[PDB]
Amino acid sequence: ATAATFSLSFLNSMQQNTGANNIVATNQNGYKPGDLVSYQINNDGTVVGN
Amino acid sequence: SMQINLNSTDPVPSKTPFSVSDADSYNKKGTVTVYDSQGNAHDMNVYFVK
Amino acid sequence: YSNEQEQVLGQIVLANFANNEGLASQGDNVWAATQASGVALLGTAGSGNFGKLTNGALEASNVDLSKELVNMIVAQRNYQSNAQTIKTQDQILNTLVNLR
Amino acid sequence: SFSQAVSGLNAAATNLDVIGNNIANSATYGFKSGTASFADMFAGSKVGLGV
Amino acid sequence: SFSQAVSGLNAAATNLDVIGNNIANSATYGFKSGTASFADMFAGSKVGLGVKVAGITQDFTDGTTTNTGRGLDVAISQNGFFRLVDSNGSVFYSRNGQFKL
Amino acid sequence: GKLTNGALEASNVDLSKELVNMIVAQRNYQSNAQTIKTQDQILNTLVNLR
Amino acid sequence: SFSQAVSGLNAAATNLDVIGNNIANSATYGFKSGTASFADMFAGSKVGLGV
Amino acid sequence: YSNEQEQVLGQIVLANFANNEGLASQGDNVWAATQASGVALLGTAGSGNFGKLTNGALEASNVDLSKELVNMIVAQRNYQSNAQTIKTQDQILNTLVNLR
Amino acid sequence: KVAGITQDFTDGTTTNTGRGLDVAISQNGFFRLVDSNGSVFYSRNGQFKLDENRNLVNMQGMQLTGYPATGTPPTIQQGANPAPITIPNTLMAAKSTTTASMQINLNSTDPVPSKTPFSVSDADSYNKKGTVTVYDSQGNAHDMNVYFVKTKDNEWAVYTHDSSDPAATAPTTASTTLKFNENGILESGGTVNITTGTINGATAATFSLSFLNSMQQNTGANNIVATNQNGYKPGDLVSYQINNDGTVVGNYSNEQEQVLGQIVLANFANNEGLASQGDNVWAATQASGVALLGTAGSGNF
Amino acid sequence: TKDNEWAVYTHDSSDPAATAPTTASTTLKFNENGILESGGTVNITTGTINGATAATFSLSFLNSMQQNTGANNIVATNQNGYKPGDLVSYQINNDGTVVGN
Amino acid sequence: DENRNLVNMQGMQLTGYPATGTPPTIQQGANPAPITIPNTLMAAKSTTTA
């Protein structure tokens, strides 16, 4: 398959002698596929599938 | 995106070259997962060395 | 092992969430992380924001009988007082349908 | 008409069912307690509509 | 519903039966104590449906070795079971060791 | 394991630990018997409404 | 049920009768002493049924 | 017998069915075989698929008492709620038969 | 005008009973029944019993259908044309041995024996004596003895013999050799083929005897840790059960399992169109879609 | 007698005035794999008791096996004769077939 | 269970951090795999210091 390029950002980190090293928060905006498990109707009038 | 805390009084790795074979010459190893366009996963290890 | 040595075989990973009380329940003693719960945020036992494990122990059930046996009474009285509106409504509608 | 009382009768039944389930699960090991919370409802009128 | 009450009342009766059985078998030789462990029940809704007996396990620790004096008795000190056959052909595994001819 | 002959194995039932669990199983039974009474009395009124 | 208690109480009475008999026959000449053997009882289910 | 001998006066035969719950309960503590159960399939005590006997013992009736005393409470409410339909079917018929 | 009586297909309460042949669904799905005409029905009540001809059936005489089972050993076809489910009390035929495995940990400090004519009863002439059991075409057992003898550095010869053949010759040549690495890893000579003798006119069981995953690293004395084969004597049915994933399995007296089918579920593109047919069954028709069969494991079921 | 061959002898044992049989009535020959090769049918006459005309019958050892099944056993026997009897009950089945016991 | 995985009372496998090679030491960023307790033999280790 084709490759993936992305910007990785260490924004708002710190080093101030806090014991040992640990990662406190991590995220990205990609997702593995799946299939339909439910639908519902919102109050605005849209229908959304989960 | 990834936040991190790093210890400030942590020593330099006394091993002189960096090499991912042994678990000595780095300060911290962390992970992230990303996904390609076909959907399958890619693990990216990240190595912090003071 | 037999030769007076020991070998590690794994480590139990824990996970803590950015928000509890939003995990769906799936029957037996398991949950399932969804929206309004967050991503996993995995970690180990000792370090970080995770409490220690102890072995040879089971967590108990946190259900206090003194606080649930005195809510049955309030719920039974709420049921019996909501039932008292239907009786007046029945009697009013009986009067209205067999006038004349 | 009947809905003002039928809504209360229906909302006080889950308030017994959750207590019954908390009583019946008093001996399993990974159990967490159950509570329910109510909230009234209004349309564009001025009288209520139930629970 | 009656269901939340009756499933709890059903599962608290096997919890007394498996204690009465352990009490009554306080002198059988190759016997292991038991316990019952439960598990809750949920449908697709958010309220619970009751409780369910998940399975009765057994405690396989070793009892005390009691002297008898007779010749055809064997006791085991660690893991392992005697292997006996029935008249049919079915194999069985046991821990009690009172033998005869 | 070893084999010791001329001896049998006892029952490993601890009588003091089972004469305590009866007192906590009987209270569970007697508390669950108070939900049937509430569910019966909240059907008595719905039967005798009219 | 009643069975787990009542069969256990019935079978822990032969365990006193066979001791009383051996205490009584402490002076007769041909007597050989004895004990009793128990066995558990299991139906097709998983909960035991007595002794 | 009185001459250092033993005679064999027969062997007790057991039976085993391909399907229970088709046996019709006839009179006393006795079942009878028919269709939807199969043929008799007689056999010996020990060998085969048949269990062994026991001398000096009987078999009780497997009826729980606490499990049966909490189904009467459900059956009584089912009866009293079915009786509240005949009430309405009589009242609507009474109010129909007297208009003209 | 009364438009139409609708149903409400939410789930009920799961009540435990304690009987063997009772099953119940926890999400969307229906059992698929037939009867004596081929009219398929769909149901949700799961009180099943057997009959005189030993087919699974509900309490009014409608046969429970599922995926059939065949093969050697019998396997469940994934999507075949559905058939009624039978539980036959016929006996199992025997199966003849085709492969056998035997791990072994030899001793790295074991000196070469001096009585160099390799005997059978003169117990100096071999290091290790192991035994495996194999089954012929009829079901008779044959004991294959193997003898492991060290010849030189890191080299072990393996001799085979049969112990139940009454006309058995004593072997004079080695069956195979095993050469070991400097570290203690097996390299080559890892397999052999060998045919056992003959008793009662039966077929000669030929089989492979691979010595895989063995080691030789000064492990005290010599031992075998894992011995197995793929054969069994016959038997007859002692029990049947319904597993948690749908497959019905019968247990026989020779410690084997045999599948007999699995229960096919059916989920519809639309409920509310199934016309009721008296007893505890429905009937698929127009404004409900096609049946859309499947398995109870995974998917939408 | 020898491998995969068995000999079947018949005798009648109600009338004791019959011939003590030592002649081989028939032989059963089995396959090399363990099914029945040939020779599954025999004809047997019985004796006479109380002046009734005797019975000649076919006897079929069909669908046997010889596969080291532990020990010997019989699994299925049938014949098509009966003694007289009188009516005790009648019923109607689920396809309209009136039957009587 | 019989394949020697750490499995809870209903039949679901308990994950964790795996171990690598010999002498095994736990990684910190691997893809979490279920824990097994193998019964295989420990290979030897030759002397390097005294």
CSV table of N, CA and C in Angstrom, one decimal, chain C residues 43-78:
chain,number,residue,atom,x,y,z
C,43,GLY,N,-0.1,1.4,30.8
C,43,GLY,CA,1.0,1.6,31.6
C,43,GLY,C,1.3,0.4,32.4
C,44,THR,N,2.3,0.6,33.3
C,44,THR,CA,2.7,-0.5,34.2
C,44,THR,C,2.2,-0.3,35.6
C,45,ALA,N,2.6,-1.2,36.5
C,45,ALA,CA,2.0,-1.2,37.8
C,45,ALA,C,2.5,-0.1,38.8
C,46,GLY,N,3.8,-0.1,39.0
C,46,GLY,CA,4.4,0.7,40.0
C,46,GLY,C,4.5,2.2,39.7
C,47,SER,N,5.1,2.6,38.6
C,47,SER,CA,5.3,4.0,38.2
C,47,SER,C,4.0,4.6,37.8
C,48,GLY,N,4.2,5.9,37.5
C,48,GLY,CA,3.1,6.7,36.9
C,48,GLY,C,1.9,6.9,37.8
C,49,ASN,N,0.7,6.9,37.2
C,49,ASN,CA,-0.5,7.2,37.9
C,49,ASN,C,-1.4,5.9,38.2
C,50,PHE,N,-0.7,4.8,38.4
C,50,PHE,CA,-1.4,3.5,38.6
C,50,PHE,C,-1.0,3.0,40.0
C,51,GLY,N,-2.1,2.6,40.7
C,51,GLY,CA,-1.8,2.0,42.0
C,51,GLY,C,-1.1,0.7,42.0
C,52,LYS,N,-0.6,0.3,43.1
C,52,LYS,CA,0.2,-1.0,43.2
C,52,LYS,C,-0.8,-2.2,43.1
C,53,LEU,N,-0.3,-3.3,42.6
C,53,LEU,CA,-1.0,-4.6,42.7
C,53,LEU,C,-0.5,-5.3,44.0
C,54,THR,N,-1.4,-6.1,44.6
C,54,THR,CA,-1.0,-7.1,45.6
C,54,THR,C,-1.6,-8.4,45.1
C,55,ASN,N,-0.9,-9.5,45.5
C,55,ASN,CA,-1.3,-10.8,45.0
C,55,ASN,C,-1.8,-11.6,46.2
C,56,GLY,N,-2.6,-12.6,46.0
C,56,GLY,CA,-3.3,-13.3,47.0
C,56,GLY,C,-4.5,-12.6,47.6
C,57,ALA,N,-5.2,-11.8,46.8
C,57,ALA,CA,-6.2,-10.9,47.3
C,57,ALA,C,-7.2,-10.6,46.2
C,58,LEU,N,-8.5,-10.4,46.6
C,58,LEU,CA,-9.5,-10.1,45.7
C,58,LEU,C,-10.3,-8.9,46.1
C,59,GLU,N,-10.6,-8.1,45.1
C,59,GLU,CA,-11.3,-6.9,45.4
C,59,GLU,C,-12.8,-7.2,45.7
C,60,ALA,N,-13.3,-6.6,46.8
C,60,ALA,CA,-14.7,-6.8,47.2
C,60,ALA,C,-15.7,-5.9,46.4
C,61,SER,N,-16.9,-5.8,46.9
C,61,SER,CA,-18.0,-5.4,46.0
C,61,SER,C,-18.7,-4.0,46.3
C,62,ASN,N,-18.3,-3.3,47.3
C,62,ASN,CA,-18.6,-1.9,47.6
C,62,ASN,C,-20.1,-1.6,47.6
C,63,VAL,N,-21.0,-2.6,47.7
C,63,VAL,CA,-22.4,-2.4,47.8
C,63,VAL,C,-22.8,-2.5,49.3
C,64,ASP,N,-23.2,-1.3,49.9
C,64,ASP,CA,-23.6,-1.2,51.3
C,64,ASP,C,-25.1,-1.6,51.5
C,65,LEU,N,-25.4,-2.6,52.3
C,65,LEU,CA,-26.8,-3.0,52.4
C,65,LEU,C,-27.6,-2.0,53.1
C,66,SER,N,-27.0,-1.2,54.0
C,66,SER,CA,-27.7,-0.3,54.8
C,66,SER,C,-28.2,0.9,54.0
C,67,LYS,N,-27.6,1.2,52.8
C,67,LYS,CA,-28.0,2.3,52.0
C,67,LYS,C,-28.9,1.8,50.9
C,68,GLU,N,-29.0,0.5,50.6
C,68,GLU,CA,-29.9,0.1,49.6
C,68,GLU,C,-31.2,-0.6,50.2
C,69,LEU,N,-31.2,-1.0,51.4
C,69,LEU,CA,-32.4,-1.5,52.0
C,69,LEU,C,-33.4,-0.4,52.4
C,70,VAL,N,-32.9,0.9,52.5
C,70,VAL,CA,-33.7,2.0,52.9
C,70,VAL,C,-34.0,2.9,51.7
C,71,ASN,N,-33.7,2.4,50.5
C,71,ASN,CA,-34.2,3.1,49.3
C,71,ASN,C,-35.3,2.3,48.7
C,72,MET,N,-35.5,1.0,48.9
C,72,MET,CA,-36.6,0.3,48.5
C,72,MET,C,-37.9,0.8,49.1
C,73,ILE,N,-37.8,1.3,50.3
C,73,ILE,CA,-39.0,1.9,51.0
C,73,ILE,C,-39.4,3.2,50.3
C,74,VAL,N,-38.5,4.0,49.9
C,74,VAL,CA,-38.8,5.3,49.3
C,74,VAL,C,-39.3,5.0,47.9
C,75,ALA,N,-38.8,4.0,47.2
C,75,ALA,CA,-39.3,3.7,45.8
C,75,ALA,C,-40.6,3.1,45.9
C,76,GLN,N,-40.9,2.3,46.9
C,76,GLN,CA,-42.3,1.7,47.0
C,76,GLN,C,-43.3,2.7,47.3
C,77,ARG,N,-42.9,3.7,48.2
C,77,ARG,CA,-43.9,4.8,48.5
C,77,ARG,C,-44.1,5.7,47.3
C,78,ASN,N,-43.1,5.9,46.5
C,78,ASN,CA,-43.2,6.7,45.3
C,78,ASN,C,-44.1,6.0,44.3
